[model samples]
Target chain A: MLIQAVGVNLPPSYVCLEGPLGGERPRAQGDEMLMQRLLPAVREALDEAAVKPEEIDLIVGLALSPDHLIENRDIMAPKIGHPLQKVLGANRAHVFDLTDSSLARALYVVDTLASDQGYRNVLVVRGESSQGLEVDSESGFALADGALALLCRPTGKAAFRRGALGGDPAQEWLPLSIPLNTDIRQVGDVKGHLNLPAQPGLPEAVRAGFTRLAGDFPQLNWVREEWFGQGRPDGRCLGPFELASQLRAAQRDRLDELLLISFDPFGMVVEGVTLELA
Target chain B: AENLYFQGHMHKVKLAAITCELPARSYENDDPVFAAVPDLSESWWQFWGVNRRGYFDPRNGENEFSLVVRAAERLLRSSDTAPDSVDMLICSASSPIMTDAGDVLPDLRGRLYPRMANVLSKQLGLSRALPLDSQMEAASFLLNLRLAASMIRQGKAEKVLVVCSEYISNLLDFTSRTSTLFADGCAVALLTRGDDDSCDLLASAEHSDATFYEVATGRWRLPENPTGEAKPRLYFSLFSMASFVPTNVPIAMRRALEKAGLGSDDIDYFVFHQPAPFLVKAWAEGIGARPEQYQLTMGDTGVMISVSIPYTLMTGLREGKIRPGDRIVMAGAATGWGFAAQVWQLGEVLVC
Candidate 1:
């Protein structure tokens, strides 16, 4: 599958660090929430790709808000995929969301649909909102609220590989959710707090995992260590955005082949895709 | 290419086996919990076709993960497939929270890391499978079925485990009418590549009309009070979907049927998402299918959300209502206000 366009929306509001433990978090107010921006992002991607809403055959959404457990509860509804299709007038698209999932897996699934199942003009939209959710100030990263849209088509320009990485459980120190004991029955108690304790030997595990993947696909030659928002305000958007950024640069550089890896901290797996940009 | 009906060249996939794990505890209509709700009465039993509802004993550590893990284990043990040979594990759960063992408090780590599918990957020893958590609300089972078949056709996997578990018992407001209509249970189905199209998924269709998104919702928000004694609450609710479901579902069902180049009469059996007895009956009738063609088995389990279709099919198979070579149409309408339908050619499948 070929990624024809990438649209992103990052809220400008900064998370004000208040109280002792940085109690204040970036909250997208009202329609500014990450979920709401999904439409604009999709619109942008559609515009960039020169594809109309009616041309979209499928729209797969990824909105990983841990605060709401049972459903992907948003201010409007549990899922944004359907509403997104309605709002965008994507009349021909079959909409759905893959909650708490990986983009690499999504790419593969969408690839199968486009490659084998004959679907054209597919959109993968992502939105993350950490409004009521807290963050781990000491985790060497900050949680940012954002949304992204990637429009893909069957071009046979990509090859993908996936494998597990680091420690018995790679996400031992990285939980982007409320405390386990949270009583979701109570609204105030539904807020999540990021838990990224710098565990022993975990960094080395992450390093080795990426190094091996890079070594295995030497021809692609592209690699990076800051796969999980090392120096950025992080959220699920970082993974796709990082890869999209590399692709942007690769295009300008006339690069024919490029490799990108997305690590699911929770699942302890690294999903790699080797793309032929030409 | 105009329709979703699988044509030649695409690999065929079969539904190999299906198993369900219901909570040990059950509540009959006479349970004191129902009496606690003012509007509910004995009529609910006949109206909903649910004499009893199953709920996990959180005190005993029964929840979504536990039920599905057991369901998958039983399925693997009953089937001849080796644990390590499973290629992908796809799991769906409406209630994703987990309570501690021998206690009622939620387990901190369970809700966060290693999704239900990932944990199942380790527990079931599916060493090579990709663990995925997919959601389409009640339509999840069919969505996963379509995905599993697509992957097999695309050479992504040979064997896939699709599990749907719901612990809505914990998310319910017992005082409301939904309390009597929902239940907790897990159903696991195994799908594998078949050399022939004997059990192939002939046609499938999925649509989302977010216009009715608010018909079913569960969200967190503040109550009327703001004092220390008051707090925000979370609960699930369902409004009348008569206008949305009966009107829209047939469109999807017809599209799928037409894609397969068949009429309603060509389908031998019907497996539909059992949100309620009335809706299932209505959907079946709207599609011009007779009641005898589909079974209403939610009388004991209430509506198991994502587990409804498989559980219903398992019971139908067990009772000899569905047989090998039968052409079946499985359909569902879900919380995203999503609707999906698929026509299949049945094959011998293990059921328990």
Candidate 2:
């Protein structure tokens, strides 16, 4: 199947803000909230796709906040006044939560859903709460919230021809915590580190994932890396830009998919997707 | 090769309910106006890895449209209909995939529906797919159903599958309040031919009125300095179009009922197109219809275009408000231009 319709929403808070982590406070209000922007983003996408609410069979959320501790679909349904049964009903729609780190999760869901014969069309929605950025004094400077929607159907337009998936479990890179709080000495080097900086080995992990992916999909000559750092760092952490340029130099027709590899002081997940050129 | 209609068979078409799935997002702490801007791309793609502008970022796995497909598959499986049994598939959406500046036919023929070739082999599955190019109009959904019904009545096929999916999050200008109220989702419904006494396609009517206004026009432009360095960046700018709710929705309803030889009194429930909570309230009151006569699921899921009306009807039926022989009216006004209304009668309750 191909993507029949596509819609995107980016809360105003992030519009025109400088990167490298520090900029004037964009208008701070509810409009900046990721969830708030997500609703309209997805709605516009469906509207673009000409989809209706009752006709939706499932909902997929790709963001950290919604799935970290609670079932986002459950919590959100009541707020929207969606029937409990419709969510938990006999038809019990499927809800997947890939929180905080959403790029890889989004591609995985697309591939899985497209491969399934039962689904005629799918709705994909993603957003983030920029408010969380305030928690970290160092990283609070560069944060923005936005949402996007893509409607996939069995036959319509835009088909997913070639795609790839790869990950490195050993590259737990910036390990956030040592398992069970066991003394760091007891677990030795294998147990992983805790609360390290966002840099270190995480960027390398991202580079490795992309390198392998590029080799697997020869058609992919361009790459779009959705990286999160203090600001476009120097050459040491230039993995994203380097890979992106490498793909483009090969004369690829736009990056088919985005490779998202995130590091949170502990563990990292890498994923990619192909985009249709207009 | 023959058409069959079961008089008292009591078959109920599968009308999927609305589901909302979004990342844990809030704007309370950040800039408020910034919060309302649609940010799915930044959060999912830009934040993760894809840096190109305008092109979609599929990194965020659980976005709205992907989930809809997953949910539809589960519903169909629970309904006990195998993938091969799907005869005629109709995908209706405002987004169309154009290849070489022409429509691109998604390759689902042999792969997705391997067992259903006899029914869908002719057009290679492209013919069954319908793209509604009517801007942001919410009423086009009913028109889509009308077209599907016409095809069914004309012996074009046996079973018809309709999918209504949207990602409203993608259209917000981030700077405008008018467009901030929307959200993302996908809704699916199946229609079949024959005079089956189950759920019947009773009647439908469409109305259009152009209210052009410079302020009301919601125009989107690419940002000068997009988040990424990709060319042709995607951006939305809103100019409020003339603010006039299509008063013709009720007028068209009356005409639809007249065509069906029915009357307002004949409709047991009214499912209005959910543009906003206020629209539903105003339209319901203006039509002299009780709040209970209409479906209000849009409050939570927001306005889901074509899926809103049918979803409301299915919700009402599940709640016991609609019963056999009861009539339901689906109505709405769309962006760009036009208002449309459709009426359906409950034939037999299909007890799955």
Candidate 3:
């Protein structure tokens, strides 16, 4: 299955954090929570794709929060998927949070699960949340609060105009989240700011990875993403921001496809995905 | 008319190697674990039939991570496959306490970011496997198995590993009587592909309605201010407890059975998730499953949430109630307002 449409949603407001070099964090004001962000983000994608609430067969959300961590509660916000369903009145979606995943898995869902399950269009939403986390993943850019929603409707088996995890198999990747200490509630911790490395080679290992993957697909434009606090840590939401941004640019420029590369220092895994334009 | 269907893949899938584990501490009602909670009566324990349940012993370094490791390791030691040969790994749990660590440990508090599958992959040396984590409250493990089945059907993986670990009993409000039923335990189910239909996944179905999203909820809150000191509380509601299973589960079970061209009588052994023994019994009866067809094993095991279904299935297997190739109907529901049922034809279980 291939992508049908792409949508990006950033908060109307940004709050700064005590991030390295100083920045404002993103905050969801008065009664605003992660679901609120999902509401706007998914609405945009579904609307743009011309898909309806009932038409969406699955909604996969990726983000990190303390709801699962703060207590013995379930891993997601109570009825995480249903809340979005309720908001959009998306009666058909089976929602669940698949946090702590690489972007590769999201594409994997589109390519394999969605279509086989009889779903023509699947909504894939990724972003961070408002909870304050001492952010530290080693990806060079500051992890920011943002979102990207895509409607993956494969017209054929061709996943990308061109897509592959194309980098060196032995090459190391940096983490957006890493467990530095002990806390039970902490599962999706974004570790290390951009590489102010004690060893310069660590930063190069990351860049070399991005370069090699992009080096494979020359026809598409390039995009890289890391987060900074416009909000608290949003989990897998950060990767989509850059992808969404590039897709928007591609749309404006009459471009046909775009390539995205993201790194998980925690797993040292690099993921490459190509999104075909409508 | 609504669209409802269960399409089994051409590839064969087996419900193999059911294994389980509980942590160090065992408790009957009135144990110290419930010492802090007030107003417990014998009738309460009788209704739930929780004669004993296991608790993770902090002294023993047992938590979600450890319990899961124990279960998976046992499967590895007993199964036909080695650690290095696992094609995929899928993990699920009720309480996702340790965020970054990815394992559900409510006791450990620090900076987050340890994922259950990756760390577990490293621990298991599953060098060739693709790691994935899934959550849908109590239904997590089954959903994991369902996904693994799909992966196998698509030729994505040959042998898939499914793990369910629950330690939410640690976070349950000990004061609440309903909370007392929950306990810590882990279970693992292995799904392997078979050719020429050695066994059958006759029919399987699942549905979720988040509309009752708040029907049961536990919130995580760190006290706004610690005058002397205040900590986070896991708050919840269980009003739907009375009607949840009776209403939603039966329909799913019926559909699965009906779709399979069978009825309650055709099922040799029925394995149902035990929210409470009474509830399990009532649910079993409503569906016309006979007294001997289903067993209530709750009292000794308590409510292991995600582990309940498989643990009960294991009990049936051990008691010889569920023999090899017995037609079994597995049905259960979880907190996402989630539900599932699969009428499975068993092959030889790789019993350890």
Candidate 4:
């Protein structure tokens, strides 16, 4: 599968929690505030890809702080002018949500769709709002709120290659000392650990999967090393770096296609794109 | 897992500690600790298995204080100091204790380090006390170490005492096959003022990722036997070492060591969460570490939950085996969600 197009959207009014709206209201309120930004970002991502909303076979919504009352896909799809029933009718185009600690869910969605052979093209989207809270707010600092879209097709301009996923349940969690609220806005005490495994683990899994792919496709050098670094700033970088460095060191050739998986707090998603070698 | 932090000081400091406390039945082979705690037994069975053949033992007498106090006294005696010379106290364990209705720490403190005088007096013996309960397990030990390091850097406390105790026999359900793997033990470590020649702490990192298949849920209830009495019965079982370790530990260690800028070769000793003797050995091998470098203390003490690695270290230190210049690596994965790792040098060392 190849990714022929890419699109991204960001609204000026939807400031991140640490942005201009940092102190106006509590950080918990950022979810609703983020939706305002999410609407335009979704449209923009689709537009950038030059893929019409009507052409989308499936809609995958990825968000950390989603609106509590509305189903994320239902609320954002109509605004993008995509009919809910037409795409998600009677299980034709399934609407699913993948929430972990980070953005790896995006990649998982792509892998799931491609391997299953049931779907041809799938739409992956992610959006966030960082202007409504302080940079160090317990609820979470306003991350730069933006939406990105990637169209996954079985035999498109780019192809879904390979990926691996693994984890340790014992080492996975926030420190118990941190306090958290019961509702949507209740902020938990901030600990050094981010409890989402999907996002952090995705980079490693991608690295592991891509390493295996590189073994077979030795000529494929268009690796997305920069985006891999973005997914996991902590330890996850080592694995990906190891793989990318080894690939580059072994083969000194220009690249072709690239796709990176990422996740934030609430959802995990992947993005695939064809690269023009520098 | 333990974490290392550089505070802009001339030298880096590493602190190590542990806890050991067992329920009543751990000391008695036939005692039914699981029978007494129906809920816990049910959860264990659901996660492990009823048919699983494992036993619970703490390897300590009823007077667990003697062991902890003796360990503290030994550290003070070796260093030419007294119990009151300690600056802070942090206790972590997985045991049920009634503290004059006070929390777990107060109950243990009243028995162990009661009066505050000199180094112990200034902090009211409450500098950083935590129970950790059952949910936190091994990860709690790493967190306490981080707190101790932060407090010392912030000038809150110069010395810290981190202790862990667990008596699993008290909750053993004999009728059920799953209650055997638990063991009882106590461990204590005294973190005091050290110069560049004493010991250095390095770096620590924690990561958590929730997988869908990781969730475990089962219904269980106590059964009444022919004796017309509740024999502390438990029903559903969930025992399996295979599913737990492969799913959580590898990714956690990868993330942790990556953050610390160290690899398997940098560690002189690898301490793991005590799941079982074979499991610990297998985990070490799987991660590319030698089994000989790991301390297999679980065989004698059973699984101490949070106290396993600490107790092993304490025993090793007391026996004069783990020397002063060793580089130690520790990592653990909890059932609730994720994994964590900490790396530190044993001698008084500083990071550039």
* Candidate achieving the largest lDDT: 1
Identify the superior model by lDDT, candidate 3 or candidate 4.
Answer: 3
- Per-residue lDDT of candidate 2, residues B285-310 (tens digit): 76667887876675445455555665
List iRMS for all predictions. 3.3, 21.9, 5.1, 19.1
What is the per-residue lDDT of model 2 for residues A130-198, given as tens digits with 9 covering 90 to 100? 332222233222223455555555321222212222345643333221111112221111111112234
Residue B163 C-alpha lDDT in model 2: 53
Query: Candidate 2 — which residues are off by over 4 angstroms?
Result: A1-278, B1-60, B95-136, B213-237, B241-243, B348-352
Considering chain A alone, what is the TM-score of candidate 4? 0.47
Superposed model 1: Cα runs more than 4 Å off:
A14-31, A66-77, A114-116, A155-158, A164-178, A181-190, A200-208, A221-240, A253-258, A275-278, B1-8, B42-45, B100-114, B222-233, B239-241
Alpha-carbon RMSD of each model: 4.9, 19.3, 6.2, 19.2
lDDT of 3: 0.64
Error of 1 at B320 (Å): 0.4
lDDT tens string, model 4, B233-273?
11222434346555456556665567668887877877777
Order the candidates by DockQ, highest first: 1, 3, 4, 2
Q: What is the TM-score of chain B in candidate 4?
A: 0.67
lDDT of each: 0.71, 0.42, 0.64, 0.42
Query: Which 10 consecutive residues of model 4 chain A have the lowest summed lDDT?
Result: A175-184
For each candidate, what's the DockQ? 0.47, 0.01, 0.31, 0.02
